[PDB]
Amino acid sequence: AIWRSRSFDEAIEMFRESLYSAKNEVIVVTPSEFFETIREDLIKTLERGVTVSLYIDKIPDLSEFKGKGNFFVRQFYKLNHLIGMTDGKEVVTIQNATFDSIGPPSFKSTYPEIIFSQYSLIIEIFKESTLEKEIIGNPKDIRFFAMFHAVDFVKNHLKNRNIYAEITGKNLESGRLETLTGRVVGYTLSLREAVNNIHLETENGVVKVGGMFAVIEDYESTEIKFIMGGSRS
Amino acid sequence: AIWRSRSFDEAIEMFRESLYSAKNEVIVVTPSEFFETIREDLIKTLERGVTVSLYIDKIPDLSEFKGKGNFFVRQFYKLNHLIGMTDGKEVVTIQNATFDSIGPPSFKSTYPEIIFSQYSLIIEIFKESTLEKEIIGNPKDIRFFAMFHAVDFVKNHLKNRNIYAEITGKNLESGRLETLTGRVVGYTLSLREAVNNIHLETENGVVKVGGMFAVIEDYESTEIKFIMGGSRS
Numbered sequence: 001a002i003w004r005s006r007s008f009d010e011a012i013e014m015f016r017e018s019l020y021s022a023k024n025e026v027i028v029v030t031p032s033e034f035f036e037t038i039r040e041d042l043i044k045t046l047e048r049g050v051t052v053s054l055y056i057d058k059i060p061d062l063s064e065f066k067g068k069g070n071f072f073v074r075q076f077y078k079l080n081h082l083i084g085m086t087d088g089k090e091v092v093t094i095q096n097a098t099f100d101s102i103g104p105p106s107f108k109s110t111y112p113e114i115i116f117s118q119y120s121l122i123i124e125i126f127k128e129s130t131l132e133k134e135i136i137g138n139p140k141d142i143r144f145f146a147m148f149h150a151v152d153f154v155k156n157h158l159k160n161r162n163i164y165a166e167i168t169g170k171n172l173e174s175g176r177l178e179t180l181t182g183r184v185v186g187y188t189l190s191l192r193e194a195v196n197n198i199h200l201e202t203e204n205g206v207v208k209v210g211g212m213f214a215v216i217e218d219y220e221s222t223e224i225k226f227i228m229g230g231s232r233s
Numbered sequence: 234a235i236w237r238s239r240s241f242d243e244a245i246e247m248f249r250e251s252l253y254s255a256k257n258e259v260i261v262v263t264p265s266e267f268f269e270t271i272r273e274d275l276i277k278t279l280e281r282g283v284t285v286s287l288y289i290d291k292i293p294d295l296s297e298f299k300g301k302g303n304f305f306v307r308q309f310y311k312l313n314h315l316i317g318m319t320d321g322k323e324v325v326t327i328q329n330a331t332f333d334s335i336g337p338p339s340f341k342s343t344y345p346e347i348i349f350s351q352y353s354l355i356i357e358i359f360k361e362s363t364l365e366k367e368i369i370g371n372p373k374d375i376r377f378f379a380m381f382h383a384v385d386f387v388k389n390h391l392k393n394r395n396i397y398a399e400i401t402g403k404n405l406e407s408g409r410l411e412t413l414t415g416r417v418v419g420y421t422l423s424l425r426e427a428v429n430n431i432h433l434e435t436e437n438g439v440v441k442v443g444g445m446f447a448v449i450e451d452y453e454s455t456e457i458k459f460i461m462g463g464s465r466s
């Protein structure tokens with residue numbers, strides 16, 4: 001479906017309703033003007049164990065976020081739209097919110113063509129951003145739907161800590177859904193062309209797990225859980 | 234509508250059919266692998282007086298393009314999808330074409346939510362690109378649908394040449410369609426936040442004309458024609 005509105009209030013309610021449904025990760029791109037509007041909906045999302053991956057033009061006071069969950073903040077100056085993408089399944093977009101908050105066009109959709117287009121947009125923003133904050137409140141259960149965020153996390157931590165994974169994804173040879181477990185032993189992150197995957201050692205050998213829309217890897221996944229080595233002991 | 238395919242051949246035919254309908258401008262983002270596939274469809278588009286704004290990871294041999302029309306090429310390393318957006322009205326996208334050309338998911342749509350998402354994607358690519366070629370074969374009739382491309386052109390030429398315009402667009406106060414004529418006397422291009430407009434001197438004073446989805450300007454337009462000063466004499 002596509003749901004449409006010209007009420008900022010209605011759109012923000014749809015945004016909140018979308019975040020409330022999240023099980024793994026929400027990616028939020030927001031003008032800093034609207035951080036206070038969504039701050040508590042962030043907090044409540046983190047408190048369910050869902051990852052929040054925020055993009056914002058100025059880093060706010062994040063005192064309140066201490067220990068609340070798994071939270072990543074990247075600085076990107078500047079997108080004038082509020083975007084939320086939940087579990088890679090649904091997006092809510094408020095267009096040009098910086099300039100009209102009020103009556104802007106907004107939409108919510110699960111259509112894969114819209115998700116592809118926005119996934120691609122978010123990856124360009126990712127390339128154009130800098131990581132400013134990472135809080136890993138739950139190192140036994142670090143969830144992602146976006147493999148490029150998962151791989152960025154691997155890149156920053158693998159040299160110092162072992163990282164285990166549970167992944168549900170599509171076997172690109174057979175087309176069937178599988179659940180894999182094992183140890184992350186490497187990764188590919190070719191930033192400029194947006195190729196990204198983890199190399200996961202399983203009982204069947206080391207396989208490559210790509211993200212949404214993957215082609216070259218052995219698996220495609222939007223359901224990723226990492227477990228830091230030693231965290232469960 | 235949304236049209237979908239898993240045939241590269243079918244998708245390329247849809248891409249060609251979309252370009253064939255263009256009246257003002259086509260934006261094409263292509264891996265360089267596919268330039269030869271679309272080269273002649275570029276040429277034929279230019280020969281109708283339509284602007285081609287190409288993004289590509291490596292600049293090809295463009296000998297053949299000499300004098301053919303109004304052609305802009307920007308280098309961007311690298312997008313793995315073929316995207317064509319025609320007149321701001323329709324997009325065709327072939328996902329991950331670099332890796333599968335063959336059976337990739339492709340789509341064609343006129344839905345404004347898809348156009349908004351891809352317009353936004355293309356603007357990020359624009360920010361991340363460098364202009365490598367500009368050929369102005371028809372200086373009396375330089376057409377655009379994308380105001381950020383039109384403003385980039387103004388930025389590079391206004392100091393050296395007068396530039397006149399004919400614009401059809403929506404008056405953002407009245408909501409009605411108008412046709413405006415006059416002289417371009419300035420512009421706004423705030424690259425990092427993607428604000429872009431021309432300042433057009435009309436018989437009613439100097440007005441700001443923004444592009445698709447504009448809010449802060451006096452007009453929104455996807456139907457822009459520039460005429461270089463002295464070109465008609």
Ligand SMILES: OC[C@H]1O[C@H](O[C@H]2[C@H](O)[C@@H](O)[C@H](O)O[C@@H]2CO)[C@H](O)[C@@H](O)[C@@H]1O
Nearest residue numbers: 120194195196210211213214215216313
């Ligand atoms: O199998 C190759 C990669 O495919 C996808 O990456 C795409 C992404 O879907 C798209 O939004 C973006 O614009 O381009 C990249 C690369 O072409 C997977 O998400 C990746 O994990 C794969 O590496």
Ligand SMILES: OC[C@H]1O[C@H](O[C@H]2[C@H](O)[C@@H](O)[C@H](O)O[C@@H]2CO)[C@H](O)[C@@H](O)[C@@H]1O
Nearest residue numbers: 080353427428429443444446447448449
């Ligand atoms: O009126 C402000 C600007 O609105 C639009 O620009 C948007 C664009 O639609 C969107 O795709 C992009 O991501 O952000 C920009 C800026 O918020 C018009 O196209 C512009 O011409 C206006 O300046």
